[PDB]
Amino acid sequence: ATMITSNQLGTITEDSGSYTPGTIATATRLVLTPRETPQSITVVTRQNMDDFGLNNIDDVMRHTPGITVSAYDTDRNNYYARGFSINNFQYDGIPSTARNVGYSAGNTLSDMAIYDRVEVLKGATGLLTGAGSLGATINLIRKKPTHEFKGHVELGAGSWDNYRSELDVSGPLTESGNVRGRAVAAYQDKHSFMDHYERKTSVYYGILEFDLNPDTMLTVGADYQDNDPKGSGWSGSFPLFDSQGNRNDVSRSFNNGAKWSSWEQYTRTVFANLEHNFANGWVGKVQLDHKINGYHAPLGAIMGDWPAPDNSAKIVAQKYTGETKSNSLDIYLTGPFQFLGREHELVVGTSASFSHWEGKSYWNLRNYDNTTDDFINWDGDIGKPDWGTPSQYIDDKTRQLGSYMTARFNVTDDLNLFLGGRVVDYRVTGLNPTIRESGRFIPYVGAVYDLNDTYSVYASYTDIFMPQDSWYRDSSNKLLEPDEGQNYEIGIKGEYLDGRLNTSLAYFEIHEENRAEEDALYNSKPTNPAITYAYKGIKAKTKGYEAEISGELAPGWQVQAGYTHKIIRDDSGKKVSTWEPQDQLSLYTSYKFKGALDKLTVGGGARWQGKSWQMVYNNPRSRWEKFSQEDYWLVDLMARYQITDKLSASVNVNNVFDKTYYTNIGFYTSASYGDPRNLMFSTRWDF
């Protein structure tokens, strides 16, 4: 018929083995091609994740172009987006409130085995997502059930006793098709080059659809991922400084962690939602959502200038437990709007979210000896001390509301205007100095002009803010106004062949307001409660350019790659985010062969980042020290052979040259090495 392989969220990727995307509504909730989208965008398709064996999300952020994957500890990584740290995840267009990573749970790792694509929206997301963070907003998208039947089961084992396996099954459940359903689940247990670390995750998910015509699908389902790591290290992989001695040298596989230390993060969620097709040529969607992010973290690790002369080092132990539920109501109407001349479109919409995070933390240990026989050569084996009584409780509930409305006017059959905004109110009624904000306006303004039938240009003023935590207060005792910012963008995009190939390069400049910087002088802290410690709020500026291609480079030649020049400093200040390389080159590509051996595909890619540095502190000598990560040229090859019409055979080797490099260097004075040469064989479906 009208060839509906697309949808509300936008044309799917589990088909067109083309690394380039189809239509993303992730920006204005209004379906649009990339070119028709006036904000910087970069998306990892499914045929891409597949080719390179990008199993968990991390394995995507590493391969996403423009983003930098830095680490904290074994089970915690951070994503760098345009000078800032990405901290906004949007599942099927829905944001999440597992905001704080100190008590991280679920976000930094989601087995892809269930999504069709992960669309990252660079710039200022505020329009759709409420309070959030500058940089980018990740946006996973689940697998929606297939009309005709389809499914598969994949196995596969990689290095360090890395074994995994999923199973995808979808189709109709009644002749007519009034009802369609899909179920998928995967299992993965792997160790690591690092000693005693052996995490195992598992994910189940079931989604279904209920037709009735314009009484369009009352689709519903629920997913659940469970990460139970053991031997989890914490903050870095090893302490940068020994007792007082200079630097510390240690195997690529040392692990400050405790054999028993682990950071179990789990997330289960349920959604329900029915879309409706109105006759005016308009459609309105309504969705409910119940999700929960819990965390079971009984950490145990050795930290702090510790390889002491007598070869022994003390170790901090601490336990953190917590779950955090959330309900979300999001309804929206989006369709053709006649004003004059020709039809335009609006997308009136309002949302609501009721979260509730409660949790404990134990660090008032009892009857414990945290000293260790010897440092060097150690398999993080120490007693799992008895955590006394919770030493800090947590009972906070946030009620973020807000309504929005976006306009896609077109003065000319080339130039279209984007007027619109999202107002909002934030309420975090909890156990600490109650705070809330309301009536703040987040604006959305952009326009695209169609030059040749090919290239086109856009400009944009995206915005976003974030009511800050209570920790942050100023000289007096006021929580520095919310951390806000706007992304000033201008670039030109270009598509070729209905949308098989797609290019774009733009100039983005971000301006940060009230950035939370630790007040300095303030040691001679005068009486007032804000006493002890207080931060100040100073302005920051982030400017840079970005360019990346993606799509059908030839006949069956897929390629996606990008380069990004970034620089960020604070009011006539220094360079902040010195770890996120000022320049980065990402290039990934696969080619299927012609006739001769058209039963074989080959691919590979490479990333590059210029000098990376951090500013630590050598307590033992008080003298501050610099640390730089020379250069980065990482390459990885892949290959896959379709031996039978139904049954694939492939193999990826992720760090060809085995580049001994650093992933983090200035975290609480630690460091973590980099996945040395990976290797993973796989086999596709059937029997």
Binding site: N100, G102, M303, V316, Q318, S361, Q392, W471
Partner: peptide, 8 residues
């Protein structure tokens, strides 16, 4: 940042 208490 975020709030509390690894060694201090």
């Amino acid at each position: 940042x975020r709030x509390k208490k690894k060694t201090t």
